């Protein structure tokens, strides 16, 4: 269907594939156990 084909063309024009690949390439931070014995939590409402 030409309508759907051109919709996909518009979507690809709006979003390059490289940006999507790079966003997945970005990694987030590991909550880590501390010296005392407590695992420090980065915010769930802040950050990746």
């Amino acid at each position: 269907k030409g309508e759907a084909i051109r919709i996909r063309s518009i979507l690809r024009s709006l979003i390059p594939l490289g940006d999507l690949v790079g966003v997945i390439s970005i990694a987030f931070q590991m909550p880590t156990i501390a010296k005392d014995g407590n695992v420090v939590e980065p915010d769930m409402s802040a950050g990746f």
Partner: protein, 48 residues
């Protein structure tokens, strides 16, 4: 519904944001990298 929504979204390109301006836009990847930097910086993420 999807066709109408995407036509309105592309007719008003300003809905996308500063990343997807198309004119002088750093891109989605750069936008999320600068947003991560905002997240580490307290003054730029928080009300301060």
């Amino acid at each position: 519904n999807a066709n109408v929504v995407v036509r309105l979204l592309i007719r008003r390109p300003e809905c996308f944001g500063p990343a997807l301006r198309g004119e002088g836009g750093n891109g989605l990847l750069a936008a999320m990298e600068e947003a991560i930097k905002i997240a580490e910086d307290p003054s730029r993420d928080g009300p301060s």
